[PDB]
Amino acid sequence: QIWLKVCAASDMQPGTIRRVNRVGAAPLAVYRVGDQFYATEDTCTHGIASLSEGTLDGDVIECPFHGGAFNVCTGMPASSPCTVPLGVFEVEVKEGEVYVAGEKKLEHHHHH
Amino acid sequence: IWLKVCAASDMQPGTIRRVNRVGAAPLAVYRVGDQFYATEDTCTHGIASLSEGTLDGDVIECPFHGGAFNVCTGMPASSPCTVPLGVFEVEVKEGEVYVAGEKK
Amino acid sequence: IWLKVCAASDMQPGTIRRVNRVGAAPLAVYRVGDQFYATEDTCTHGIASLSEGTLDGDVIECPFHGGAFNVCTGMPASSPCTVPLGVFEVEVKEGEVYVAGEKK
Amino acid sequence: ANVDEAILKRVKGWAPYVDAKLGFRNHWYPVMFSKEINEGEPKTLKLLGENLLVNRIDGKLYCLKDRCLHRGVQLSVKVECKTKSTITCWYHAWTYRWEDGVLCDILTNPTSAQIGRQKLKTYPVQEAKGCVFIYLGDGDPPPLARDTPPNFLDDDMEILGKNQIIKSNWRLAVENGFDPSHIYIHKDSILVKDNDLALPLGFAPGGDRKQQTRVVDDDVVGRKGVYDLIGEHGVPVFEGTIGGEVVREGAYGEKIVANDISIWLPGVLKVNPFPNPDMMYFEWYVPIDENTHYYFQTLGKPCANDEERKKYEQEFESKWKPMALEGFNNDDIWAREAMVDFYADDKGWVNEILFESDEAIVAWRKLASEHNQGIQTQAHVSGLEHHH
Amino acid sequence: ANVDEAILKRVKGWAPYVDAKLGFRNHWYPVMFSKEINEGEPKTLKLLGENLLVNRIDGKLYCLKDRCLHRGVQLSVKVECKTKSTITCWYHAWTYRWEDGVLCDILTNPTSAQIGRQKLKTYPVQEAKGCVFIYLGDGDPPPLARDTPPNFLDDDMEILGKNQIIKSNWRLAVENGFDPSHIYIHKDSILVKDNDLALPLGFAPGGDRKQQTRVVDDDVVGRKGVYDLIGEHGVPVFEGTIGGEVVREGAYGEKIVANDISIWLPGVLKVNPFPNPDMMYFEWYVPIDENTHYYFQTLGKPCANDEERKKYEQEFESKWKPMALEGFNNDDIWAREAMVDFYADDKGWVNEILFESDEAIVAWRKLASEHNQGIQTQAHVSGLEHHH
Amino acid sequence: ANVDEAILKRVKGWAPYVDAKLGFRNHWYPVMFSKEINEGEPKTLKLLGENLLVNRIDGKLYCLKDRCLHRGVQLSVKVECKTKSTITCWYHAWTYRWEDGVLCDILTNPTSAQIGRQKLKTYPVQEAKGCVFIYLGDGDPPPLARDTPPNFLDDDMEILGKNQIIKSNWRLAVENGFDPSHIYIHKDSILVKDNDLALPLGFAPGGDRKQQTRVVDDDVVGRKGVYDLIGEHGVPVFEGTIGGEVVREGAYGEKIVANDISIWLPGVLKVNPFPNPDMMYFEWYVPIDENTHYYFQTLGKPCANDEERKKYEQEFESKWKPMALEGFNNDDIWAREAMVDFYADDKGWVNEILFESDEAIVAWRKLASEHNQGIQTQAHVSGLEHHH
């Protein structure tokens, strides 16, 4: 269950967001920026809002609760009042099928 | 019954003319384009004379507080006015403007 | 009487030069384009040096509070300044700038 | 438009609610108890920012805006009710009828053209369960039931209570009241021990978001509200821990109460059963102005006869009022006051960091934004402004 | 620019007046009685929003702005008059001459280039009829007669009075005083009964509106004012009715007072004769700031000798001051205060609903708007501003 | 950001300083004395407009912002320290560690996703010379020495003092303290006579502008400040004259004090020697909010052992505190307050008319504008804002 099957790449239009629910775990949000796919936790770090119900502006997702925002590629805050980075999950497309990582990316074994 | 105001030519479009009546409240005659209208001269929101106000199209603005009315219907157009203005009959016969001695 | 300040070319357009005088208040010489003017250097509203201010056309802006004066008439151009600046006639002969010794 | 547009633009889920700093217009609101207004004795009060006057004539209540049409003075500065059906302004004697607000006479000039042509604003007033409700709105009012919690108007339901002015915006009072986790502030209430109540410290949510509440928008009476269902799938917290060690315990009393909690527009909470298994509690947070509200508390208990009513009143006075309405709810008063600073500049509506149980508050904010009957504005207070 | 431009645009008949919240600059104003300021004893006061200091030197009065040019502190915090003709700031000792406000010395630096190069604002001060008038304006002042009601300065006129600070904008005071129908608030005054005055409840106007007032656009001394002529062709109302029934009656005394009432710029009312046939009454409503004014009351009676003046003084103290100045006018004080809220947000100037007798107030508003000598602004208080 | 842009544009020489109404962020500030904060006894205070909580745990001081992340209430309304290293909000039990402000537990919901994922703001706290300094800034703090005057931290310098809240903006306090000519307000201080001090009334400056001060920006520890050198070329004024005649003289005592006076960022003055030839005086004017500051006074005297320290302490209590800190500096308190009105609308920063000795103040304004570590804004108080 390292890679979670989400949907067919063609099932998502550019600039859309899809929520991925997981048993016994917090939901994720998969974003399609152009022809690329990204994913983060679905719950806004500033509260209890669902980012999949927000608005995607390019590679920046805006929370529907207070207007906070995050960069979907890095998970870093883009607009106040958000200050806590989102956990980011790797996404890959195999056979035109979108898969999202079951574990978040870590500042472990990567670029210095 | 109908009282003589003036000749339709004495009033330029967009002008107002006060009509004082003996033993009665004054009226105001407005020429909107080529049509004439009449209402009480006194603003329903106070004691101002609407004939001293500003006419913009078919709407007269009171000089006291800026309230306004539609000169055709007499209905309030701008706050603080809320009480409809009394409308009086007007007819132009032989190039002369006439106003009904009573409201409709 | 007249004080020889400097060569006209010693000042770039739109600049100000402070002229110190022993036993007397310093003066400010302004070069507006190709013309030269002079006033007392100390702002009349405080202790600021107008030669350290901003010249906008023929108006000198004090660096302290934004007060201003017309360098030609010496009259205040912007608040908080209210007391007129002392003006000194300036004369340029043979490329040399001279400033009157006395205010006038 | 009572709040910075920049802020309203940020709270897309409940902007109308955030803008409703002065409360919602076109709803009924309780302002006093029937026994507080006597025949022919006008009483003043401020509701939704408007100064009002209430009078009882032939036993029926009437409400007139307490502001003369002439120079805008409050008639109440010097009350002059010269005939049973009218009130005369103390300044230039403009006289108004209580039943329709019409300017019927002017003692300083009986020939004035204003007589019979102007009208002072009147508001509908209705008495129910010994409570005085005023419809702060325009046009014919809807039935009172629409703006009251279920059962409040039941025939057998005997209502008793208290009212007072509290220093906080009405919304802070509403949210605190419907706040599932604020139960923590009541852990040391005398009602807990003195009435052997079962009271957890909080709740560990369970189930999905939708399951946390029940939004009511299909009530035949038109009622609009939200039920707090956090306890249906949640695990009540009776042992609070820090670093794993228990530092606080809930109340292990035998009496089970407050298992049915709901908030209703325009802003009234229903707690059942409370403060005792055989009673029902209702409390309103009525907007007086942007900084204050009436904390209208009412407790109901079915009574079939005068004997039970008398007995009920005795217990209310000797136990329920002091032990519950005050001994329990007093902590709610300073709690709401504690949030004033954070929301005073309207910034709290953006910077607040919510957690799971606030799902109930969010549901309320959305319900209120979508179903309120109007936003009261300062212009309603001074005089509506427009140009069409 | 003291009021929202949107409001000023609406009141086309008298925008300058509505904008004059701080009063009219360039007019004389009474601020205290001569006996209140003694030789070498500086006194503080606030006029048109400006803090002032008045001193008596060699019997003559001098007025300096109570704000040091250096760091803007009030000199009065710690008065240091080190020489008869000067005052030294307690902070850094900048010293000013009372005569012309010139900065003549600086004790902390006798070599400062500022000495003789700065001037503290001074205002003309004149004493007349035992009253201290200050010309709160710029340049050479006009004769005091221009800003006083007719006869106030008559040689034989003996003036006695009272002064106090009242919490209302000066304009609310002026309008109430010149208000023909406000007479209704005086129906129960002890003066009416104790001095057997005839006093109607109001008036039913007669004639055209032009006949309701008499505007004086110019006097031999440039006075500007308006007389209330509602009683010229109007019918005095002595029976107040509601629905046709008499609920109140006016006073049927034999003494007829207030033959003529006139208001004059900058804001002083003359009632003649009052409160008795042999006397004349004048009252000023002097702007202190946007929320308060001096209620400067004066009673005049022609006296030919010291004997008559003495008798008059006795009558004033034992009867007229308590029965009229207080017994009659105290009701005017709370009446003014009652209008504060409605006009506080400047909206009352738009929402007021005027009636016939207000023709007097309207005439005053227009006269004041057309002939005032300047609008005092907050910038006059802090320091006039202007950028090139 | 805190002042009208039009005003800031006018003061091009020190706009940052004029905008710093709330003080400079990222600097150390003393707020109380060590003996005032005891073990497990949380204390509240407001610094740079922010509400803070300070506590001593196992002897070490910790500082947490006194505002729960949840609904923005002050934790101090009802303090709940359930474990030695944490504090629990009284509202919904969100629990924070004093050590790093991490939200480590939530009693009302132990399953909350917020746990361990939020952090309450904390600020570095350091005790030195019996004084508690808080670094009101972000990131790793600089050495305390950078924000203290020279010698304050000397090994043998025994520090004693007093602190209180004064009603004036901190800058008015700083300027009055460094004001060379304000010495005039101290001419009658009991300290002058009682301690045989030599004290002039002011100074006649000498030399050019540059010579009036010494701007320090080469200090190795990074401290930034200005020395007042007016007395190096100036002639002290002992005979104050008006019109050339002597009206006041300075003090001809034998003891020479205040040889060197210097002001340092963030706002602390050093006067040496003072109030006696063998002591050193330092005073801070710490911003609490836009209208108030802490007047943190400290007196230092070299002591080699406990005997001398105890002796000094006794002299401090019986003489130096009442005679100098109060008997001398009390006049500085009302002097600062006297400037409040002129600068309250921010216009005094434009209308002030300065004279020669103010060169010292100007030098400070420029230094502060160029070397401050950040301008505190209202957004820092409510929560920093940033869009897109």
Ligand code: FES
């Ligand atoms: S919950 Fe997302 S910005 Fe607040």
Ligand code: FES
């Ligand atoms: S009198 Fe016409 S708008 Fe008021």
Ligand code: FES
């Ligand atoms: S010192 Fe020049 S404007 Fe103030």
Ligand code: FES
């Ligand atoms: S203000 Fe009420 S009658 Fe005039």
Ligand code: FES
């Ligand atoms: S403030 Fe008056 S001399 Fe300095």
Ligand code: FES
């Ligand atoms: S406001 Fe502190 S835990 Fe909720």
Ligand SMILES: [Fe+2]
């Ligand atoms: Fe509660």
Ligand SMILES: [Fe+2]
């Ligand atoms: Fe009166």
Ligand SMILES: [Fe+2]
């Ligand atoms: Fe001092």
